[PDB]
Design an enzyme around this catalytic site. Structure first.
Site, mmCIF file in Angstrom:
data_model
loop_
_atom_site.group_PDB
_atom_site.id
_atom_site.type_symbol
_atom_site.label_atom_id
_atom_site.label_comp_id
_atom_site.label_asym_id
_atom_site.label_seq_id
_atom_site.Cartn_x
_atom_site.Cartn_y
_atom_site.Cartn_z
ATOM 1 C CD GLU A 180 -2.874 -0.189 2.615
ATOM 2 O OE1 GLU A 180 -2.821 1.011 2.989
ATOM 3 O OE2 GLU A 180 -3.515 -1.040 3.240
ATOM 4 C CD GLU A 196 -4.859 6.240 5.954
ATOM 5 O OE1 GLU A 196 -3.672 5.906 6.146
ATOM 6 O OE2 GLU A 196 -5.838 5.714 6.555
HETATM 7 O O1 LIG Z 1 -7.999 4.547 5.168
HETATM 8 C C1 LIG Z 1 -7.673 3.940 3.923
HETATM 9 C C2 LIG Z 1 -6.903 2.641 4.149
HETATM 10 O O2 LIG Z 1 -5.680 2.947 4.890
HETATM 11 C C3 LIG Z 1 -4.741 1.763 5.161
HETATM 12 O O3 LIG Z 1 -3.875 2.082 6.066
HETATM 13 C C4 LIG Z 1 -5.583 0.530 5.572
HETATM 14 O O4 LIG Z 1 -4.734 -0.601 5.377
HETATM 15 C C5 LIG Z 1 -6.844 0.374 4.779
HETATM 16 O O5 LIG Z 1 -7.634 -0.743 5.315
HETATM 17 C C6 LIG Z 1 -7.687 1.574 4.812
HETATM 18 O O6 LIG Z 1 -8.828 1.317 3.939
HETATM 19 C C7 LIG Z 1 -10.094 1.615 4.485
HETATM 20 O O7 LIG Z 1 -10.473 0.752 5.658
HETATM 21 C C8 LIG Z 1 -11.833 1.035 6.138
HETATM 22 C C9 LIG Z 1 -12.009 0.141 7.360
HETATM 23 O O8 LIG Z 1 -12.038 -1.242 7.010
HETATM 24 C C10 LIG Z 1 -10.765 -1.941 7.090
HETATM 25 O O9 LIG Z 1 -10.552 -2.457 8.336
HETATM 26 C C11 LIG Z 1 -11.629 -3.236 8.834
HETATM 27 C C12 LIG Z 1 -12.027 -4.386 7.907
HETATM 28 O O10 LIG Z 1 -13.286 -4.904 8.282
HETATM 29 C C13 LIG Z 1 -12.060 -3.963 6.445
HETATM 30 O O11 LIG Z 1 -12.084 -5.090 5.586
HETATM 31 C C14 LIG Z 1 -10.844 -3.110 6.127
HETATM 32 O O12 LIG Z 1 -11.009 -2.683 4.795
HETATM 33 C C15 LIG Z 1 -12.871 0.832 5.075
HETATM 34 O O13 LIG Z 1 -14.151 1.279 5.579
HETATM 35 C C16 LIG Z 1 -15.059 0.257 5.867
HETATM 36 O O14 LIG Z 1 -15.341 -0.596 4.673
HETATM 37 C C17 LIG Z 1 -16.269 -1.652 5.020
HETATM 38 C C18 LIG Z 1 -16.408 -2.496 3.763
HETATM 39 O O15 LIG Z 1 -15.236 -3.254 3.537
HETATM 40 C C19 LIG Z 1 -17.554 -1.039 5.410
HETATM 41 O O16 LIG Z 1 -18.340 -2.218 5.776
HETATM 42 C C20 LIG Z 1 -19.470 -2.365 4.947
HETATM 43 O O17 LIG Z 1 -20.526 -1.341 5.271
HETATM 44 C C21 LIG Z 1 -21.709 -1.492 4.418
HETATM 45 C C22 LIG Z 1 -22.657 -0.360 4.776
HETATM 46 O O18 LIG Z 1 -23.413 -0.548 5.961
HETATM 47 C C23 LIG Z 1 -22.671 -0.940 7.140
HETATM 48 O O19 LIG Z 1 -21.824 0.066 7.546
HETATM 49 C C24 LIG Z 1 -22.431 1.331 7.802
HETATM 50 C C25 LIG Z 1 -23.553 1.218 8.840
HETATM 51 O O20 LIG Z 1 -24.290 2.418 8.941
HETATM 52 C C26 LIG Z 1 -24.505 0.083 8.502
HETATM 53 O O21 LIG Z 1 -25.395 -0.088 9.588
HETATM 54 C C27 LIG Z 1 -23.717 -1.190 8.218
HETATM 55 O O22 LIG Z 1 -24.616 -2.205 7.811
HETATM 56 C C28 LIG Z 1 -22.300 -2.854 4.541
HETATM 57 O O23 LIG Z 1 -23.383 -2.953 3.554
HETATM 58 C C29 LIG Z 1 -21.301 -3.894 4.239
HETATM 59 O O24 LIG Z 1 -21.855 -5.237 4.465
HETATM 60 C C30 LIG Z 1 -20.081 -3.770 5.075
HETATM 61 O O25 LIG Z 1 -19.108 -4.729 4.673
HETATM 62 C C31 LIG Z 1 -17.412 -0.147 6.579
HETATM 63 O O26 LIG Z 1 -18.668 0.564 6.820
HETATM 64 C C32 LIG Z 1 -16.361 0.893 6.359
HETATM 65 O O27 LIG Z 1 -16.092 1.628 7.551
HETATM 66 C C33 LIG Z 1 -12.555 1.698 3.916
HETATM 67 O O28 LIG Z 1 -13.480 1.404 2.813
HETATM 68 C C34 LIG Z 1 -11.178 1.440 3.409
HETATM 69 O O29 LIG Z 1 -10.876 2.298 2.291
#
Ligand SMILES: OC[C@H]1O[C@@H](O)[C@H](O)[C@@H](O)[C@@H]1O[C@@H]1O[C@H](CO[C@H]2OC[C@@H](O)[C@H](O)[C@H]2O)[C@@H](O[C@@H]2O[C@H](CO)[C@@H](O[C@@H]3O[C@H](CO[C@H]4OC[C@@H](O)[C@H](O)[C@H]4O)[C@@H](O)[C@H](O)[C@H]3O)[C@H](O)[C@H]2O)[C@H](O)[C@H]1O
Length: 198
Positions: free
Chosen positions: A79, A83
């Site tokens: 990566e 940010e």
């Molecule tokens: O900051 C950028 C980047 O920086 C690096 O240092 C790091 O290595 C990267 O991971 C980071 O990327 C960003 O990470 C965030 C957080 O997720 C990460 O860590 C936790 C892990 O679970 C993830 O796999 C990692 O990617 C990420 O934001 C999250 O993305 C999730 C999707 O992968 C979101 O989850 C999804 O949310 C949908 C919407 O609804 C849900 O969430 C909102 C609520 O209101 C609702 O009630 C929920 O149901 C869901 O439909 C879906 O099922 C669910 O998977 C999550 O919300 C979000 O915070 C960034 O995208 C990523 O760029």
């Protein structure tokens, strides 16, 4: 360099708005959460850029970003990151990951509020040099050493998310939400033409 026009949206597509005629992609954060767009191809080195105008108002809690990653969600990833940390709209954090290991954070003072208008953010990624530029000035340069370097092909990514739960809120602040909907604008996203792979 060429404009990025073919994107994918990894979740919550109704919170990502693409206006191709204005070359603008908009990510919204509100009660629905946020979203994440990416290139549909990976890239093997090159120069990546975007104009970015960050959201208005009290962005405490939120993380908005643009970054390269070999695959979001993978824990052995390569990566390179920009940010923004929502509690302080006059800084940006840079970082990079090598096979899942990061811990190379640096904080940079912007000299402006990242929501005041569009500014240009650039990542130059080569096999032994990475540079980060803001408004045409190099703000950080790193060179390959024994301690790893990003080498896997990577997608271009951008997201807005609520990071207030990270480190007890010390990283981005608590999420206040007083000024939702928060809209982050990405314009004139440019990706390499000849090192796309896939
Ligand atoms: O900051 C950028 C980047 O920086 C690096 O240092 C790091 O290595 C990267 O991971 C980071 O990327 C960003 O990470 C965030 C957080 O997720 C990460 O860590 C936790 C892990 O679970 C993830 O796999 C990692 O990617 C990420 O934001 C999250 O993305 C999730 C999707 O992968 C979101 O989850 C999804 O949310 C949908 C919407 O609804 C849900 O969430 C909102 C609520 O209101 C609702 O009630 C929920 O149901 C869901 O439909 C879906 O099922 C669910 O998977 C999550 O919300 C979000 O915070 C960034 O995208 C990523 O760029």
């Amino acid at each position: 360099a060429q404009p990025l026009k073919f994107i994918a949206v990894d979740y919550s597509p109704e919170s990502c708005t693409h206006s191709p005629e204005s070359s603008t992609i908009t990510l919204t954060f509100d009660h629905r959460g946020g979203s994440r767009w990416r290139s549909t191809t990976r890239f093997q080195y090159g120069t990546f850029s975007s104009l970015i105008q960050c959201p208005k108002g009290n962005t405490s809690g939120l993380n908005f970003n643009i970054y390269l990653s070999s695959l979001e969600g993978d824990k052995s990833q390569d990566e390179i990151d920009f940010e923004f940390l929502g509690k302080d709209k006059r800084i940006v954090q840079t970082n990079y990951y090598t096979a899942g290991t990061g811990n190379r954070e640096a904080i940079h003072d912007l000299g402006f509020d990242c929501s005041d208008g569009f500014h240009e953010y650039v990542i130059k990624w080569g096999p032994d040099l990475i540079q980060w530029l803001i408004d045409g000035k190099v703000i950080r340069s790193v060179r390959a050493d024994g301690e790893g370097f990003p080498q896997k092909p990577m997608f271009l990514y951008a997201s807005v998310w609520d990071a207030s739960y990270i480190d007890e809120g010390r990283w981005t602040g608590p999420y206040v939400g007083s000024d939702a909907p928060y809209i982050c604008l990405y314009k004139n996203v440019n990706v390499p033409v000849g090192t796309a792979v896939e």
